[PDB]
């Protein structure tokens, strides 16, 4: 058994952020903070302004990334499990969920800008941090990117959901997970842009 009327609900997925890569300078940019965070959380209510293609997001345990591809706002599972994201109308379900992915999707917010999927084929990579750190990859696999220089796995923590792009600026995948070997990191795993389009058709 079970007390169902004490029985807590899980909060919505909140933006917390962005990445601006509008201008010539990558930086991030918050937009806001804890105290509004966990009641728009709880609320599922956000009337901010949601700009640009990659959003920091937050719940009230973990914080990591979301991009806009097609339309589609893309996040890892491992940190969005299930849960709404916030809106201005309120709650928004998820539009995509693929556990075996690690892939959750929300319709892309009002004012977001869609990232165009990647057509070159090009083994330079680029991947963007929370920080807005622009890391070089070098493009291994379907779903490998090797590290030019290897880095302490923290400072990707808190990445995944963030963009892979091309030397163009195009998506070619969504940050997954990190090839670590007793604490350094030397690769990165991503959901290739590819797969999401076929879990998009
Ligand atoms: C050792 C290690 C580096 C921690 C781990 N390596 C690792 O497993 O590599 C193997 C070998 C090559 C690919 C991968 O195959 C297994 C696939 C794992 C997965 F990713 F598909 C995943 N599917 C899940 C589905 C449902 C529920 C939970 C799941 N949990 C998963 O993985 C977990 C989480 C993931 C993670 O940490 N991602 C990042 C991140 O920043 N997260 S986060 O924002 O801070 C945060 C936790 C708030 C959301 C980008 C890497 C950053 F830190 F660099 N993990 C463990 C790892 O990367
Ligand atoms: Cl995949
Ligand atoms: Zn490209």
Same mark, same amino acid.
């Given at each position: 058994?079970?007390?169902?009327?004490?029985?807590?609900?899980?909060?919505?997925?909140?933006?917390?952020?962005?990445?601006?890569?509008?201008?010539?300078?990558?930086?991030?940019?918050?937009?806001?903070?804890?105290?509004?965070?966990?009641?728009?959380?709880?609320?599922?209510?956000?009337?901010?302004?949601?700009?640009?293609?990659?959003?920091?997001? #937050?719940?009230?345990?973990?914080?990591? $990334?979301?991009? %806009?591809?097609? =339309?589609? +706002?893309?996040?890892?599972?491992?940190? /969005?499990?299930?849960?709404?994201?916030?809106?201005?109308?309120?709650?928004?379900?998820?539009?995509?969920?693929?556990?075996?992915?690690?892939?959750?999707?929300?319709?892309?917010?009002?004012?977001?800008?869609?990232?165009?999927?990647?057509?070159?084929?090009?083994?330079?990579?680029?991947?963007?941090?929370?920080?807005?750190?622009?890391?070089?990859?070098?493009?291994?696999?379907?779903?490998?990117?090797?590290?030019? #220089?290897?880095?302490?796995?923290?400072? $990707?923590?808190? %990445?995944?959901? =963030?963009? +892979?792009?091309?030397?163009?600026?195009? /998506?070619?995948?969504?940050?997954?997970?990190?090839?670590?070997?007793?604490?350094?990191?030397?690769?990165?795993?991503?959901?290739?842009?590819?797969?999401?389009?076929?879990?998009?058709?």
């Amino acid at each position: 058994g079970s007390h169902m009327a004490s029985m807590k609900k899980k909060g919505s997925v909140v933006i917390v952020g962005r990445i601006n890569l509008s201008g010539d300078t990558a930086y991030a940019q918050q937009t806001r903070g804890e105290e509004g965070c966990q009641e728009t959380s709880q609320t599922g209510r956000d009337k901010n302004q949601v700009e640009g293609e990659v959003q920091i997001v #937050s719940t009230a345990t973990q914080t990591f $990334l979301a991009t %806009s591809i097609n =339309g589609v +706002l893309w996040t890892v599972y491992h940190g /969005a499990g299930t849960r709404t994201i916030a809106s201005p109308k309120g709650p928004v379900t998820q539009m995509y969920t693929n556990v075996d992915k690690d892939l959750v999707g929300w319709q892309a917010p009002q004012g977001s800008r869609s990232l165009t999927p990647c057509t070159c084929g090009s083994s330079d990579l680029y991947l963007v941090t929370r920080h807005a750190d622009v890391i070089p990859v070098r493009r291994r696999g379907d779903s490998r990117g090797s590290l030019l #220089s290897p880095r302490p796995i923290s400072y $990707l923590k808190g %990445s995944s959901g =963030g963009p +892979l792009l091309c030397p163009a600026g195009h /998506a070619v995948g969504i940050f997954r997970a990190a090839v670590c070997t007793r604490g350094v990191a030397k690769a990165v795993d991503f959901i290739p842009v590819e797969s999401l389009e076929t879990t998009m058709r």
